[PDB]
Every structure is written in structure tokens, then in C-alpha cells.
């Protein structure tokens, strides 16, 4: 996250770190046994780390649970990042509490200047490299479909939205991938991609979760 703020320990209790010896991606806890992330975050040997603030210090609220199964979306395209969504089942149920809690799936999609909370352990610099140890937060509105398409010609599908600021300075960034965008208590986005970070006219692009809820519920109900 570039130009955001320190969230505060466990203030984003649905935020997960995906760990293959190091943090490589975010995710969102959607019930005691399931995480949603980006398909582009897929790899074997995932440990899900819940209850995390400092990803480099054991602070006392962590639950470390191995993935038993990963399900990349049937229609995921790695070239276009169309359908950039995957589900991860935990080998054991997370113990849900005030600091480890699932985030509601949407019943409807979000719209315009709906303010959203984007979070992750990604890079905090635009033209440098600094990875934070504690979770960073950005409040950002969803941008118009027309603005998003104008910003990224021939790249934005109906399964994508832009959120952030066309003036730049505030954005998601590398290592935020797969993390949440929460708008009025609902998981509406997954951190998907961008052109650099916090560049003018190049806001973050997000997986439109509302398109995927029937697939998420069907998949969870049969696995
Ligand atoms: C610009 C930019 N924005 C977001 C992400 C999230 O992964 C990445 C990397 O995957 C990136 O390069
Ligand atoms: Ca920790
Ligand atoms: Cl910078």
C-alpha cells in the first residue's frame, strides 16, 4: 500500500497473509475453513497466517493453518488476469474471534464513490522499495467503469473494477495481491493488478467479487 496508514493490530481481522516461507500475497477469510485470494497468487506449499499484524514477529493472536486444497477459478486467464480469483480450503477450521473473523460476501455489487478499505503488506513506495512488517490500510473509492476503461484501454473486463485516485499517490502495490477491498462491510474486491503503483491515471485494478458469489457458494458447499 502506497500513501496509506498503519491499520492497527488486528483491526482488519479478515486479512490473511499467504506464506511459502515468506509473505507473498494477501487473502480474505470468508468462513472458518475458506480463504479467497487472487488466482495469480496460486502456488503449492501455502500456509495461511491469520491474526497477523507484524508478519515478522509472533505477537500472540496468530493462527497458522496449511492449505488442504486450492481452487483457481475455472475461467482464470493468467495473460489477461480475467477471473483473477481462487479459493483456498484450510486443513483445520480457524478459531473465529474478535481478531480472526470472516468477511461477508456481497449480495449486490458496489457502485461509484463507494469508499472502500484496501489492506496488505505490499510495498509502501511509488519509485523505491520498502516492505512494511505491520498491515497498511488505504481508504479509496471505486472509480466509474468509463474512467477505469479509459485508464487501461483494451484491458478492463466486466470482472474488474478500478479503485483509488487518478491524481496518483495512493494505491495498492506489489505484495498486496489477493488481499481485500471491503465496502460497507462487504468483500467487493480482490487486489488483482496495476501499472506500477500510485502513478497518475493508473489506479489499482480489482477482481469484482459480486460476479463470483454463486461460484464461491457452490464451490464451498461441495468441497
Ligand atoms: C503494480 C502492482 N499492483 C498490485 C500488485 C499486486 O500483486 C502488483 C504485483 O502483483 C503490482 O505490480
Ligand atoms: Ca505476527
Ligand atoms: Cl516514493
Amino acid at each position: 500500500i502506497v500513501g496509506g496508514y498503519t491499520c492497527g493490530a488486528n483491526t482488519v481481522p479478515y486479512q490473511v497473509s499467504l506464506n511459502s516461507g515468506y509473505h507473498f500475497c494477501g487473502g480474505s477469510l470468508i468462513n472458518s475453513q475458506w480463504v479467497v485470494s487472487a488466482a495469480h497468487c496460486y502456488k503449492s506449499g501455502i500456509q495461511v497466517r491469520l491474526g497477523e499484524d507484524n508478519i515478522n514477529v509472533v505477537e500472540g493472536n496468530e493462527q497458522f493453518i496449511s492449505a488442504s486444497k486450492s481452487i483457481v477459478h475455472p475461467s482464470y486467464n493468467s495473460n489477461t488476469l480475467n477471473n483473477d480469483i481462487m479459493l483456498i480450503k484450510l486443513k483445520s477450521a480457524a478459531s473465529l474471534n474478535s481478531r480472526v473473523a470472516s468477511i461477508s460476501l456481497p449480495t449486490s455489487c458496489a457502485s461509484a464513490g463507494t469508499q472502500c478499505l484496501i489492506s496488505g503488506w505490499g510495498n509502501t513506495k511509488s519509485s523505491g522499495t520498502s516492505y512494511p512488517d505491520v498491515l497498511k490500510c488505504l481508504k479509496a473509492p471505486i472509480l466509474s467503469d468509463s474512467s477505469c476503461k479509459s485508464a487501461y484501454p483494451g484491458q478492463i473486463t466486466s470482472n474488474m473494477f478500478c479503485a483509488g485516485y487518478l491524481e496518483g499517490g495512493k494505491d495498492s502495490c506489489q505484495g498486496d495481491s489477493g488481499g481485500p477491498v471491503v465496502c460497507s462491510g462487504k468483500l467487493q474486491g480482490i487486489v488483482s493488478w496495476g501499472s506500477g503503483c500510485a502513478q497518475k491515471n493508473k489506479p489499482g485494478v480489482y477482481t469484482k467479487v459480486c460476479n463470483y458469489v454463486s461460484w464461491i457458494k457452490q464451490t464451498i458447499a461441495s468441497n
Side-chain angles (χ1 to χ4, degrees):
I1 311 288
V2 177
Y5 62 98
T6 300
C7 300
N10 300 303
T11 60
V12 193
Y14 50 86
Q15 178 73 232
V16 324
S17 179
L18 303 190
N19 188 283
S20 54
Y22 44 89
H23 165 90
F24 69 90
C25 270
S28 307
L29 191 65
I30 58 161
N31 62 215
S32 72
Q33 290 183 106
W34 288 92
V35 169
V36 188
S37 197
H40 85 257
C41 290
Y42 160 80
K43 63 211 307 210
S44 30
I46 296 184
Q47 187 189 252
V48 176
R49 298 192 162 205
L50 310 159
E52 284 286 17
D53 192 40
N54 194 318
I55 55 166
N56 275 324
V57 178
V58 179
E59 298 177 295
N61 293 303
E62 291 94 349
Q63 303 178 39
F64 295 173
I65 304 160
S66 289
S68 53
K69 169 187 280 188
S70 293
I71 304 164
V72 167
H73 192 274
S75 305
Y76 170 57
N77 185 311
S78 55
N79 297 320
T80 67
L81 300 180
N82 196 26
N83 308 116
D84 189 15
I85 188 164
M86 106 188 128
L87 282 167
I88 300 169
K89 202 185 169 175
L90 310 183
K91 175 175 180 75
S92 60
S95 174
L96 294 190
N97 57 56
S98 64
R99 292 175 170 86
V100 177
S102 50
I103 189 60
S104 287
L105 294 182
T107 54
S108 51
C109 301
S111 53
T114 311
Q115 280 285 130
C116 303
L117 185 63
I118 310 172
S119 47
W121 287 274
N123 191 353
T124 61
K125 287 179 189 286
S126 259
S127 291
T129 303
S130 182
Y131 288 87
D133 303 311
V134 301
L135 185 67
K136 296 289 166 160
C137 275
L138 179 58
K139 290 175 179 194
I142 305 186
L143 293 163
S144 61
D145 289 357
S146 65
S147 303
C148 190
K149 284 150 62 64
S150 279
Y152 299 103
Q155 294 158 269
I156 300 309
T157 74
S158 61
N159 300 313
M160 293 179 198
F161 66 92
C162 289
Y165 304 88
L166 292 189
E167 56 260 53
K170 304 192 265 173
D171 213 356
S172 65
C173 200
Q174 44 266 173
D176 287 328
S177 274
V181 182
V182 167
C183 320
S184 306
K186 300 310 196 291
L187 184 65
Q188 295 281 190
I190 300 162
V191 180
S192 188
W193 59 278
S195 206
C197 320
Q199 303 306 290
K200 198 175 95 77
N201 296 311
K202 296 295 185 182
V205 186
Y206 299 92
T207 306
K208 196 170 193 211
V209 173
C210 59
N211 293 359
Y212 295 102
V213 167
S214 52
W215 169 77
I216 293 166
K217 293 207 303 232
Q218 274 147 19
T219 304
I220 284 176
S222 312
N223 294 268

